[PDB]
Symmetry: C2
Subunit: 309 residues, 2 copies
Amino acid sequence: DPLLSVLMWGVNHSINELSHVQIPVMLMPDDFKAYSKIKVDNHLFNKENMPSHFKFKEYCPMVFRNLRERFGIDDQDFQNSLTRSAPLPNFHTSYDKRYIIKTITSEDVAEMHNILKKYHQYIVECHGITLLPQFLGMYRLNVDGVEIYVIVTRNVFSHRLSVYRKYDLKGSTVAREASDKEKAKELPTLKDNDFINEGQKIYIDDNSKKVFLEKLKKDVEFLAQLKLMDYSLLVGIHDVERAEQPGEFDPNIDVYGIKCHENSPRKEVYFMAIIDILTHYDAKKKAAHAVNPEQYSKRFLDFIGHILT
Amino acid sequence: DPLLSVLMWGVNHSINELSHVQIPVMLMPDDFKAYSKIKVDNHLFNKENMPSHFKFKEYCPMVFRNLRERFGIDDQDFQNSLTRSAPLPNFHTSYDKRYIIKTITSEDVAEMHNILKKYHQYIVECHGITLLPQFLGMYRLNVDGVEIYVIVTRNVFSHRLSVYRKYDLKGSTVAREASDKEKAKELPTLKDNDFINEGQKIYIDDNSKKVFLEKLKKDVEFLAQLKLMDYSLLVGIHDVERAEQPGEFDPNIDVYGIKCHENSPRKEVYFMAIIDILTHYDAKKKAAHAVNPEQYSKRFLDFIGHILT
């Protein structure tokens, strides 16, 4: 909450600063090693929700400025989405449901730095058309003894259309099922065995499915090159009828939406994308001390192919 | 210049921050001991005219917010006056000629802190009607090894009406004359002996002169209580005819203006005010090691009375 305040203040500050830089079409190598730090000390000048001593650091501001524009996001809109009203917990969601704010470890920050240039290059090569997470900003927040790192992404789900059923898919030969406890939540994050045993159909037409699967193939191959793994396909289902109790969406805001085909048994819109990619192979082995990257790649792409069948 | 950039950035930052605080009608004792510090470090994120490592400190932001409003100055106007375009050297003047930006010593900063509460109280008592300097903001600027302090005041002179002749008056029994070198400048700062030997008349009507002199009396008495001295009466003369080659002014922007009376030999507008008050008695004695406060008071008020005669 006070950390949230710093995030809001900092994002507002960061975007206002950039609004003055002239943005070239390209990035230089040093853009990937750059950062912006502010440290505020207010003495007997106490504000409303603002802590009186805080630090705010933005990593690689020019890279993320470049990415946001490649992802179709205007800086002023981004600013408003994160500063007109506080993000809500759920990670956090921007008050307008457009962006996600996740807390990550310094280890994830190191790995994001380590892939940022290859990631950016891949985003350039696919013209921003990918099922990968859209990384929009990365920050460090300090308030009096607490340091956290946040990364901001575009929401996989719609900002308007409610998701009534959500799946987290991995293709792992291991037993992946939601818990009897977890299945008691209101939006259970169901898993591979849920989907498979419960006969979930995804009714998208054949052209939509071929396009999707080809995107997925290039995306997952790219993640495999980076020796990344443990990522999921996130699947949200919006039931048009249950919402009405009309199912159109802006594919330029809800960029992961795919309408169902015309003989779907029920009017449905699907939101599908890869999430949680920053687990490097060796990060998972260290946490396991408290499944190779290609193996994950194959078992994943095979499963999603079977999902859509 | 890079310090000027920090000043502009900082003033912009300071006013935007205050635009969010709710301003009470009163100040608390702690408001006079408060400050706001920002430290910026940009690594490989080089801006246009902005240094990439700087510090900016605002002293007592609530007191000066309070003073500005008592002096009739809106914060957004103040901001624009100091940030839409750079101040010009001459001290510095805001690009719209409304405010003055003077560089002061840390010793002056200490003395300003030391009188700020009595000063504020006096401004409250006279409803902001005074010939004293209108202190609007005080700041500390750091860029890579340089630290300076600035204090911002309302310009004694008009923002529109050009001054063709300027006097610096003290009433000192000592020999006070501008130099044969100084008198070669374009706007010479003439002195007591200049004025006196050169038969300068100030043609203001008797009511204007009685009002002025009574203000001056209360102001100088107040400075004398503080054991301050070495201050001057600054006198600017705007010649309406020389400008035309029409002499009206807004007494709410040009608050020190006094129109001449209707039999003045030439259409003239006078700008008069006390300047440079922060010399404490003992500050002058230390600099002299490189005239009591009441004596200065008496010789000053007597002289200005004779000036206007």
